[PDB]
A paper describes a structure:
In summary, we isolated and characterized the three GAORs from S. tokodaii, and found that GAOR2 and GAOR3 share the same M/S-subunits but contain different L-subunits, and exhibit distinct substrate specificities. We determined the crystal structure of GAOR2, as the first structure of an archaeal Mo-containing hydroxylase, thereby providing insights into the subunit assembly and the substrate specificity of the three GAORs.
The two hetero-trimers are related by crystallographic 2-fold symmetry to form a functional (LMS)2 dimer of GAOR2, where the L-subunits mediate the dimerization. GAOR2 has a butterfly-shaped, hetero-hexameric structure with a molecular size of approximately 140×65×90 Å, as observed for other XOR family enzymes. The Mo-PCD, [2Fe-2S] I, [2Fe-2S] II and FAD are located almost linearly, with distances of 13.4, 11.5 and 7.0 Å, respectively. In the GAOR2 structure, the Mo atom is penta-coordinated by two equatorial cis dithiolene sulfurs and three oxygen ligands: an apical oxo ligand (O1, 1.8 Å), a basal oxo ligand (O2, 1.9 Å), and a water molecule (OH, 2.4 Å). The electron flow during the GAOR2 reaction is predicted as follows: electrons are depleted from the substrate aldehyde to Mo-PCD, and are then transferred via [2Fe-2S] I, [2Fe-2S] II and FAD to external electron acceptors, such as DCPIP and MV. Ala531 of DgAOR is also replaced with the hydrophilic Ser330L in GAOR2. These structural differences can explain why GAOR2 efficiently oxidizes hydrophilic glyceraldehyde, whereas DgAOR prefers aromatic aldehydes. There are four major L–M/S interfaces, and the key residues at the interface are highly conserved in the L-subunits of GAOR2 (STK23390) and GAOR3 (STK24840), consistent with the compatibility of the M/S-subunits between GAOR2 and GAOR3.
Numbering used by the authors:
A (entry chain B): 1 to 251, 255 to 277
B (entry chain A), D (entry chain A): 1 to 516, 521 to 705
C (entry chain C): 1 to 161
Write the structure that this text describes.
C-alpha cells in the first residue's frame, strides 16, 4: 500500500531527465504511473529516485506523417482510443478501466512489458517501431526486437521511449478480441487482427497474440492459412485452428487458453470481415 | 401512512455529499498508527524480538496463542507482532524491521484430512474436530425402503470472502479511567461486551461510526481489535489501526466452505423421500470468536437441508473441523445459503435424472400450508409455499420461451433472532424528537424504516424523527445488525417506545384538559373541543416533573420468523465458457414490507453476491497454505458489467411474522436464493452435473 | 532540475473544489492520503492495488484513482471531489438521482462512483445501459448490485439534457 | 455513607495528567479558523467591504445590528466583521486586510449621563434606560420619622471582568442536515435552545467539553457563537473560533458596575431603621442576551439590600441603563454581591459614625428566627442568623487581639433557582451504571457530589457510578450550572432518578423471588433468605423486556433557598499603601454539606475573587471609551502571593433547604461576603470612609 522512501526529480526538459537517468542507474522515470506506482506500493521495486517525465507535453501527440502515424510516448490510452488509428485505437479502448486509460501511456505500457498487456498484440501485428532517445541521439528499432522478454524492454540506463510508429493501414479491416473474466481486467487471451481485401481475396493479414507467451507473437500459421486466399467458412476455421500453434500459455488452464486462441481468432476474422 | 411506502433514505444526504465519518475519517490529538506483523506460515513455532515500537503476543495475551499468537501461529495472516509508529507509512517501514524466528510445523488444509487427527492444527488440541453431531429426523429407514432409486454425489459450497469495500479498522483511546473505542463493527454494544470481557473492566464506551458494509465479517471482535484496545490501556495515546486490503483478504471475512456427501432417496415420479450423508464444514484455525460464530452457522446449514419439501426422513452426519487457515466467520446468510444450495441442487439433480421438469418437481414436493415443522425441528411459521410457487410459475413459463437456459430454486430462511433489542425515544423542551436504536445499521437503511414506524405511531411528519445509533452512551444497550433481524426486532422495539411516548403524551394532555383524543401530536377534549398542542404538552411535562424520554426493550419470545420465495434466472454461455445472466426474477414473501424500495435494494445486493459465488468468487489456497486470491484483481467481485441485465423483484404478503411489525428479514434471502438459481440455470445449458463453484470458463467449453 | 531526496518534503499546491491548498509532502506520499489529510475524507481507500475506484476524483477534467498518483505528481492540478458537486447545498443532479433511485447503501463507494458518473456524463450525454456499466467498471460496489446505480445515472443523464 | 464526606474528586485524574479535552483541543477534518474584526470606536456607523474570506454582519443578521453590527456599532470590541482562513496565524493576517469605513458618532460612558437620554447609545432606542422601577417596602416614612440621625453617601461597586483562564471558544460543523456545536459554555442544553431560536431549526447537537471556568461569563450565547453557528450552515466545513485574551478582556465577562446613592436612617443606639435612594446599574451596549442576564441581576442587587437586618422600611429607585461599552453580564454572585456589599458597607459606616462596635451593631439588627420575609419580599427560608453570629463572635474576639485591623460582614444569599433539572441513570446488561446530569459543571466538582448521592441511594461503591454531562444527545435536556443551583437542584434530580432505579431493581428482584429486602444492589427473601444478585436482576430485566434506564426531572416548586454567614478578615497596610490580609475566617450555613472538601474549595475560590475586587481588580475606560486594562498585566487577577496567608472555613447546619438534598448553594457566597469583609477591614486601618474599589495604594498613604 505504502511506497518505500525514494527521492524525486522534476527536470526542466528532456535533456535533463536523460542525464539524471544516465548517472543514476536505478532511478525510474514516471509517466502515467499506473504500473510504476502499483509496484512501489507493493514494494516490488525500490529505486533511489523517481524522475518525473510527465510534464514534457511535446511527448504527447498523434501525427499522420505520410503513411506513418507517429505517436508520442506520453500519449494516453484515452487519447489513442479517440484518434481513429486502425486496430490500435480500438485496442487502447480495451485497456483497464476509464480511470486507468485517463492516465496510462503507450510509452509506459511498452516500457513495462507485462506479457498480458493489450498493445503488444496490436503492435506486433502492425510491425510497429519504437523511437528510443538518448543524450547520444535516437535509435529506431522494430517492436519485435524491442520486446526482449516479459518485463524486459531493449532500453539502457540513460534512455527513454519517445515515439511509437505504425503504418496507417488505410482501407484495412480490424478487430481486437479480449477475453476477460471481468470488465477492467488484463487479458486472459488477446487477439489483434488486421486484414485488407482485394475483391474477396485476403491481400494482407496480420494476427497478434498477447497473454499466451512471454512476449507478443504473430500467429504465423493462421496467417499462412489466410494470406492470398478467397474467404470461406473452411479456411477461417482452419486459420483459427492454426493460431494455436503460436500459443505457449501458462496455467485459467494452459490448455483452456490455447483453445481460446482458436475461439478469439475466429471471432476476430469474422468481426473484421463484417 | 409511511409504513409500506418506498420512502427515500434519510441516510443519503451525508453520504452523497461525502460528509460521512467512517473510522479512518476520525482523528484524535497525537494519534499513533498501528500495524500487525502476520504469519507467513500455516503452522509454526514463533519467537519475536520485542523492540522499541514492537510489541508481541506476550504484551496482549501472555500464556495464550489467541487473540495474538505468542509461541505458536496457526494460519498465514495470523497476527504475530504489533508495530506502532508516527503514521501509516512509517508503521509499514517498521514492519520490515521486525525479527521473527519460525519453526515450521506440519499443517493441514483439507478438513477431511484434518478430521483424522493425524496432524493437529494447534499443538494443544485434543482434536481438530470442533463439533460433531449426527442429525436425524423423521423416518430415514422408511424413506430409503420405499425408494425406487437413490442418487449420490459430493457437492461443494466453496470458501468466499466478504470483501466489504471498507475494511475493518479501529481507533482506541484510554484517558486513565475510560477506554473510548471506535470501530468498523456491526454493533457498538456487542463489541463493548467483548472488550469488557477481554480487558476485565466496565468503563468502556464503543462508537460504531459510519461503516462501509460488513456482510457478516464485522460481527466478531477481531484479534486486532482486542490487541488495539489492550495496547491503548498501556500506551495512553490514541491508536489508529487500518489494515491494507491484502491484509483484509488474508485475515478476515472468509465464509461458506462446506461439503455435502449426499444420497437421496426418490420415487420415479419425482417424490423426494429422504436424504442421508455427511456434512463437512471448514472452521479454519481455532480463534474462539470466529469458531463460535461459524459453528452456530454449521447448524443452520444442516437444519435447513429439508428446504420447503415434504421430506419423510433424513440422517446427516455434521462435522465442523479446524484447518491451518484464516478462521471462518459469518458471511451473508451465515450457513443458510449452503443448506438451501444443497437441497436445491439435489432437487435439480433428481429432476434431471428422472426427466422431470424443474418447476414441476418443486410443486410436487412443496409443503402445503404453514405452520409446518421440518424434519430437523425448524418451524416455518406463516405463509403459503405452494401458492407462492403458483404465482411464480407464470414467470417460469415466460422465461422458458425466451432464448437461453432457465434455472429455478425455492428457498426458506430463518431470521429475526433474539434475545432482545432496544429503542430509546426522547423529547426535548422545545419539542425535538430523537429516536435511538440499539441495532447497528451499516448500509441496510433501517434508520429510514425506523423513522417511518415512529412517525406512523406518533402521527407526525417523518422529518420530525431523527434516528441515531452506534454509541454505547446514547442508549441503554443493544444487540446488533445481523441475522436479518434489524427491521423486525429492532423495529418492534421502535414501535413499543413510540407507543409508550404517545401514551404518555395522552395522559399529560388529559391532565391538562381535566379528562382521560390524540391526533397528530395534539390532544383534544372529545366535546368540549378544548385542545392542547404537542409543544404545550411537552413544556407542561417538564413543569410537572414528568419525563418524555423512554426506553423499550423488546424481548424476543418467538422462534426465528421464516420468509420464503422462488427465484428464476435465464442465462447464456458462449464459446469461451463465459456465463451471461439475461434475466433474474425474485418472488419473495417477507411478511409486511416496511419499505419496498429498501427491501428490493437488499434483495438485489444479496442476489448479486449469490450470483458472484456461483460464477466468479472463490477463496483458494496453494499447498503451502497461502491464499491465492489476495486483491480485487485476483478475487473477482463483480463490476456493473457482470450483473443480470435486469433483476425484477416482487413480493407477496401471505405470511406475517408474529412480531408487532409483521415483518420478516430479507437482508440475507437474495444471497441464499441466487446461488443455486444461477447454478441450476447454467446446468440446464451444459448439460453435465455441476458439483463445485465458482463455475470456471474451462469447465463450460 | 528540482531534486528532493528521501528525507525531505516538498511544498506543493493543489487546487481542490475551487480553492488552493498548500502543504509539504515526502515524494512517496499518495495523493489519496494528502486529499484526506486536507479534510477531503469523502475520498475513500477501498483497496491497495488500484481496482476499486473508491478513491476516484476529477484531476484536470479526468477521472483518476487518486491512490495511484503521488501527491507531488499532482502539484499544480485542479481536483474536484464529491464535496464540491453541490452548490450552496442544492444537490448536483447526479446526487439527487442517486437519492431518488436508492443507488447507495453503506455509502462508501458513493463519492467515487458519483465522481466517475460526473466524468462519464460529460463524455457521453445520453449513454446506453451498456455504456454506463462499462463507464463505471473501475468502481466496485459490494452493497447495491449496481442496478439502481445504472438507473440513477440514466435519470441523471436525462436531468442533465 | 458518602454524603457529608470530603470525598476526593473523580474529575481530577484526566486533568492532572493533561488528558482533558477543552474546546480548542478538538479538531475535525478540514477545520477552518475564524476570527472577528471588532469596533475600534465606542459609537460609529460602519461599512465593511465584503471580500473573499471576509463576512459581515449582513451575512449573519441582515436588518439588525445584533448579534453582529451591520450599520451601527455600539462599543469598542463589538464584532463588525468575520474572517475565515486556513489557520489562526493566517486568520489574524487576514484581519489586517479588512476594510472598514467608520463614521464616528457621539457616545456615552457614564450611566448617570446616559439616563438623561441626551445621547442615545444606539440610533434606534427610545431611551438608554432599559429598566426603571421604584422599589418600596415596609414603612419608609415611619423609619425616617423615628430616626435620630441620617447618613448619606455614594458607594461604588466597580466594573470587573470574569477572566476565566480559558476564554470562550467554539467549534461548529453542519453536515447538511444537522449542526454539531462544541462550545466553552455553561450549559450545552441552554446553548442549544439559543441556537435553535436563532437559526430556526431543531436539528442541533451541542457539546460542552471540558471548560476552563466561566464565573458567569459563559451563560449567554455570545455574538461570536451565533455567528459561528450561522456561518457553519453556509460554509459546510468545521469552523473553530478562539479569541485572543485581549479580545476576551474587551468583549466578555464584564460584571458588577453598580452605584448606590443612599441615605440611612438610624437610632443613636445603632438601630438601622430604613434606607432610601437611587441604584444606578450600567448594562453597557444593548445586546439582548447580555441585557436580559444582567437586568435580572439588577433586581437581585435591590432585593438583597435589606440583608440580614430587621429594617422597617425602604424606598430604592432602580435604574439599569445602557452605555457605549461591552454589554454587562452575570459575574459570580450576579447582583447579590453588590446588594450585600451596599448594606454591609452602610452598616459599618453607621457603626463608625455612632462609635458602635462593628460586631455589636450586627447582633443588634439581626433577624432573630427564620423563616423571615425581608422588606422587598425575599423569603429567607431556614436557619438562624443570630445564633450563627454568636458562633462567629468567638473568632472576632480572637482577631481583635491580634496585630492588624479587623473587618466583618454578614451576608444572606439566594440560590438553587428553577425551573427544573434533569438526571438520567442507566444500567447496561453486564451491569455497568452511568449517571447523566442535565447541569453543566465547569470546575465546581458536582459530578463527585452526584456520584456520592447516587452511590448512597443504590448502596454501591462510588467507583460504580460514572457521571457524565454536557452532550445534548446523552440526556433528554437540562438547565445548566449557574445561580449555585447544581448540587441542590441537579442533585435532587440525581436523588429521584437513583431512587426510581432502586425501586425498579426491587420489583424485578421481587418478581424473580415471587414476593414484594434490598441491600447493596441484591434482593433477598426476608425469610426464606433466597437472594438474587445485582447482576442477575439486571440480566433478567432485559430478558423480561424491562428497561433499567430512567430519567427524572426535578421541577422546582420552592422559591430560592437562602444560605447566610459571617466572614472576618485581619489586615495590615504598609507605608506604600499595600494591603496584606493575615487571616480570613468564613462561617457559613449552606444547609446539608454534600462534600466539605469541595464546598470549602468553592468558599475559598469565591473569597479570593471577592478580595481581589476590593483590593486589585477594576475595569476602567479612557474617555475615548477604550478599556484601559486589556491583559493579565494591567487587569491584575491575584497570584499565590496576594492571598490571605490562611483562610479558615467553617460550616454550621442550622437551616436545610426544602429540597431532597437539604443543601443550599455555596458557589457564589465567598465572592458575596469577601468584598465588604475586606473593605470593612481596610477601613478600620485608615480610617477615612472608603466609597469606591479597588482600594488604590495612593488612597492609603
Ligand atoms: C487497475 C489497473 C488495470 C490495468 N489494466 C490493464 C489492461 O487491461 N491492459 C493493459 O495492457 N494494461 C493495464 N494496466 C496497465 C496500464 O496500462 C499502465 O498504464 C501501463 O501498463 C504503464 O503505463 P504508464 O504510462 O502508466 O507507465 P508508468 O507506470 O509510469 O511506468 C511503467 C514503466 O515504464 C518506465 N517508463 C515509463 N515511461 C517510459 C518511457 N517513455 N521510456 C522508458 N521508460 C518508461 C517506468 O520507469 C516504469 O518502469 C492496468 C493498470 C491498473 C492500475
Ligand atoms: N419485511 C421487510 C424486511 C426488510 N425491509 C427493509 O430491508 C432492510 C432491512 O433488512 P433486514 O431484513 O431487517 O436486515 P438487516 O437490516 O438486519 O440487515 C442485516 C443483513 O444485511 C445484509 N445487507 C447488507 N447491506 C449492506 N449495505 N451492507 C452490509 O454489510 C450488509 N450485510 C448483510 C447481512 S450479512 C445481513 S445479516 C431495511 O431497509 C428494512 O427496512 C423491509 O422494509 N421490510
Ligand atoms: N451545601 C453544599 C453546597 C455546595 N457543595 C459543593 O460545592 C460545589 C457545588 O456548588 P453549588 O453551590 O451547587 O454551585 P454550582 O456547582 O452550581 O456552581 C456554580 C457557581 O460556581 C462558582 N464557582 C466556580 N468554580 C469554578 N471552578 N469555575 C467557575 O466558573 C465557577 N463559577 C462560579 C459561579 S459564577 C457559579 S454560579 C459542589 O462541589 C458541591 O458538591 C456541597 O457539597 N454542599
Ligand atoms: S483505493 Fe481502490 S482504486 Fe484507489
Ligand atoms: S454502497 Fe456500499 S459499497 Fe457501494
Ligand atoms: Mo450477517
Ligand atoms: Mo454564576
Amino acid at each position: 500500500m505504502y511506497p518505500p522512501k525514494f527521492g524525486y526529480v522534476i527536470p526542466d526538459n528532456l535533456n535533463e531527465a536523460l542525464e539524471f537517468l544516465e548517472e543514476h542507474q536505478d532511478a525510474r522515470p514516471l509517466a502515467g504511473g499506473h504500473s510504476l506506482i502499483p509496484m512501489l506500493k507493493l514494494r516490488l521495486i525500490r529505486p533511489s529516485y523517481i524522475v518525473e517525465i510527465r510534464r514534457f507535453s511535446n511527448l504527447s501527440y498523434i501525427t499522420k506523417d505520410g503513411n506513418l502515424y507517429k505517436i508520442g510516448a506520453l500519449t494516453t490510452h484515452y487519447n489513442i482510443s479517440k484518434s481513429s488509428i486502425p486496430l490500435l485505437s480500438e485496442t487502447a479502448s480495451n485497456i483497464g478501466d476509464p480511470q486507468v486509460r485517463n492516465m496510462g501511456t503507450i510509452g509506459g505500457s511498452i516500457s513495462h512489458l507485462d506479457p498480458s498487456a493489450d498493445y503488444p498484440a496490436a503492435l506486433i501485428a502492425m510491425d510497429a517501431k519504437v523511437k528510443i532517445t538518448s543524450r547520444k541521439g535516437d535509435r529506431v528499432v522494430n517492436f519485435k526486437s524491442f520486446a526482449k522478454d516479459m518485463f524486459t524492454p531493449d532500453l539502457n540506463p540513460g534512455e527513454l521511449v519517445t515515439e511509437i510508429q505504425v503504418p496507417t493501414f488505410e482501407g484495412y479491416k480490424f478487430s481486437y478480441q479480449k477475453l476477460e473474466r471481468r470488465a477492467g481486467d488484463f487479458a486472459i487471451v488477446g487477439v489483434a487482427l488486421l486484414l485488407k481485401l482485394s475483391g474477396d481475396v485476403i491481400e494482407d493479414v496480420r494476427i497478434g497474440l498477447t497473454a499466451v507467451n512471454n512476449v507478443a507473437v504473430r500467429a504465423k500459421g493462421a496467417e499462412e492459412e489466410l494470406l492470398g486466399k478467397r474467404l470461406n467458412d473452411e479456411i477461417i476455421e482452419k486459420a483459427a485452428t492454426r493460431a494455436m500453434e503460436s500459443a505457449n500459455p501458462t496455467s485459467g488452464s494452459a490448455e483452456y487458453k490455447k483453445k481460446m486462441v482458436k475461439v478469439l481468432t475466429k471471432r476476430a476474422i469474422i468481426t473484421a470481415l463484417k | 401512512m409511511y409504513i409500506g411506502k418506498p420512502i427515500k433514505r434519510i441516510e443519503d444526504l451525508r453520504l452523497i455529499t461525502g460528509k460521512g465519518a467512517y473510522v479512518d475519517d476520525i482523528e484524535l490529538p497525537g494519534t499513533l498508527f498501528v500495524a500487525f506483523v502476520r504469519s507467513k506460515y500455516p503452522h509454526a513455532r514463533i519467537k519475536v524480538k520485542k523492540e522499541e515500537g514492537i510489541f508481541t503476543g506476550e504484551d496482549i495475551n501472555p500464556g495464550k496463542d489467541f487473540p495474538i499468537a505468542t509461541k505458536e501461529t496457526t494460519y498465514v495472516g495470523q497476527p504475530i507482532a504489533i508495530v506502532i509508529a508516527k503514521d501509516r507509512y512509517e508503521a509499514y517501514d517498521l514492519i520490515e524491521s521486525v525479527e521473527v524466528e519460525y519453526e515450521e510445523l506440519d499443517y493441514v488444509l483439507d478438513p477431511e484430512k484434518a478430521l483424522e487427527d493425524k496432524v493437529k492444527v494447534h499443538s494443544g488440541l485434543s482434536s481438530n474436530i470442533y463439533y460433531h453431531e449426527r442429525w436425524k429426523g423423521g423416518d430415514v429407514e422408511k424413506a430409503f425402503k420405499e425408494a425406487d432409486l437413490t442418487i449420490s454425489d459430493t457437492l461443494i459450497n466453496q470458501r468466499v470472502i466478504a470483501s466489504p469495500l471498507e475494511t475493518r479498522g479501529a481507533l482506541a483511546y484510554f484517558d486513565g479511567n475510560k477506554l473510548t473505542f471506535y470501530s468498523s463493527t456491526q454493533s457498538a454494544h456487542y463489541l463493548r461486551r467483548n472488550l469488557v470481557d477481554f480487558l476485565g473492566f466496565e468503563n468502556i464506551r464503543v462508537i460504531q461510526p459510519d461503516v462501509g458494509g460488513a456482510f457478516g465479517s464485522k460481527i466478531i471482535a477481531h484479534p486486532e481489535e482486542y490487541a488495539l484496545a489492550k495496547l491503548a490501556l498501556m500506551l495512553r495515546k490514541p491508536l489508529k489501526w487500518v489494515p491494507t486490503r491484502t491484509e483484509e483478504f488474508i485475515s478476515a471475512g472468509h465464509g461458506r466452505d462446506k461439503k455435502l456427501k449426499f444420497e437421496v432417496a426418490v420415487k420415479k415420479d419425482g417424490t423426494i423421500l429422504g436424504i442421508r450423508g455427511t456434512l463437512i464444514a471448514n472452521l479454519g484455525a481455532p480463534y474462539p470468536d470466529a469458531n463460535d460464530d461459524e459453528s452456530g452457522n454449521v447448524k443452520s446449514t444442516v437444519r435447513m437441508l429439508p428446504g420447503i419439501y415434504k421430506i419423510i426422513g433424513a440422517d446427516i452426519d455434521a462435522y465442523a473441523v479446524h484447518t491451518n487457515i484464516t478462521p471462518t466467520q459469518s458471511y451473508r446468510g451465515a450457513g443458510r445459503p449452503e443448506g438451501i444450495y444443497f437441497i436445491e441442487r439435489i432437487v435439480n439433480i433428481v429432476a434431471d435424472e428422472l426427466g422431470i421438469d424443474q418447476y414441476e418437481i418443486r410443486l410436487k414436493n412443496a409443503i402445503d400450508t404453514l405452520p409446518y415443522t421440518n424434519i430437523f425441528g425448524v418451524t416455518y411459521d406463516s405463509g403459503n409455499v405452494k401458492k407462492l410457487l403458483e404465482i411464480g410459475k407464470k414467470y417460469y413459463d415466460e422465461l422458458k420461451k425466451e432464448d437461453g437456459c432457465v434455472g429455478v430454486s425455492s428457498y426458506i430462511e430463518i431470521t429475526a433472532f433474539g434475545p432482545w433489542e432496544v429503542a430509546r425515544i426522547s423529547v426535548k423542551y422545545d419539542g425535538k424528537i430523537t429516536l435511538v436504536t440499539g441495532t447497528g445499521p451499516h448500509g441496510q437503511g433501517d434508520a429510514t424504516a425506523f423513522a417511518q414506524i415512529a412517525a406512523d405511531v406518533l402521527e407526525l411528519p417523518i422529518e420530525k424523527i431523527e434516528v441515531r445509533w452506534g454509541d454505547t452512551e446514547i442508549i441503554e444497550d443493544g444487540i446488533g445488525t445481523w441475522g436479518s433481524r434489524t427491521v423486525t426486532i429492532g423495529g418492534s422495539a421502535v414501535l413499543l417506545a413510540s407507543q409508550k411516548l404517545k401514551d404518555k403524551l395522552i395522559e399529560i394532555g388529559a391532565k391538562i384538559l381535566n379528562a382521560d383524543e390524540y391526533k397528530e401530536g395534539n390532544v383534544t377534549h372529545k366535546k368540549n373541543g378544548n385542545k392542547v398542542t404537542f409543544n404545550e404538552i411537552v413544556k407542561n411535562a417538564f413543569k410537572m416533573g414528568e419525563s418524555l424520554d423512554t426506553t423499550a426493550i423488546y424481548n424476543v419470545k418467538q422462534p426465528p420468523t421464516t420468509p420464503y420465495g422462488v427465484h428464476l434466472a435465464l442465462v447464456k454461455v458462449d464459446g469461451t465458457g463465459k456465463v451471461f445472466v439475461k434475466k433474474y426474477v425474485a418472488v419473495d414473501d417477507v411478511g409486511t414490507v416496511i419499505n419496498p424500495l429498501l427491501a428490493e435494494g437488499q434483495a438485489i445486493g444479496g442476489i448479486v453476491q449469490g450470483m458472484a459465488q456461483a460464477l466468479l468468487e472463490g477463496a483458494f489456497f496453494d499447498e503451502n497454505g497461502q491464499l491465492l486470491t489476495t486483491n480485487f484483481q485476483d478475487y473477482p467481485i463483480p463490476t456493473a458489467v457482470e450483473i443480470p441485465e435486469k433483476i425484477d423483484w416482487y413480493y407477496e404478503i401471505l405470511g406475517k411474522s408474529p412480531h408487532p411489525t409483521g415483518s420478516k428479514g430479507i437482508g440475507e434471502a437474495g444471497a441464499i436464493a441466487a446461488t443455486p438459481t444461477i447454478i441450476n440455470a447454467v446446468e440446464q445449458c451444459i448439460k453435465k452435473r455441476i458439483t463445485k463453484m465458482p463455475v470456471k470458463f474451462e469447465e463450460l467449453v | 532540475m528540482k531534486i528532493i531526496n528521501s528525507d525531505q518534503k516538498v511544498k506543493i499546491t493543489l487546487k481542490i473544489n475551487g480553492e488552493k491548498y498548500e502543504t509539504e509532502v515526502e515524494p512517496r506520499r499518495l495523493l489519496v492520503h494528502v486529499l484526506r489529510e486536507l479534510g477531503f475524507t469523502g475520498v475513500h481507500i477501498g483497496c491497495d492495488t488500484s481496482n476499486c475506484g473508491a478513491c476516484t476524483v476529477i484531476m484536470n477534467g479526468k477521472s483518476v484513482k487518486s491512490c495511484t498518483v503521488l501527491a507531488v505528481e499532482a502539484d499544480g492540478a485542479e481536483i474536484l471531489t464529491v464535496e464540491g458537486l453541490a452548490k450552496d447545498g442544492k444537490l448536483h443532479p447526479i446526487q439527487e438521482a442517486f437519492w431518488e433511485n436508492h443507488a447507495l447503501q453503506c455509502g462508501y463507494c458513493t463519492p467515487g462512483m458519483i465522481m466517475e458518473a460526473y466524468w462519464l456524463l460529460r463524455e457521453k450525454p445520453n449513454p446506453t445501459e451498456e455504456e454506463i456499466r462499462e463507464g463505471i467498471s473501475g468502481n466496485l460496489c459490494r452493497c447495491t448490485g449496481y442496478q439502481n446505480i445504472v438507473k440513477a445515472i440514466k435519470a441523471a443523464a436525462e436531468k442533465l439534457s
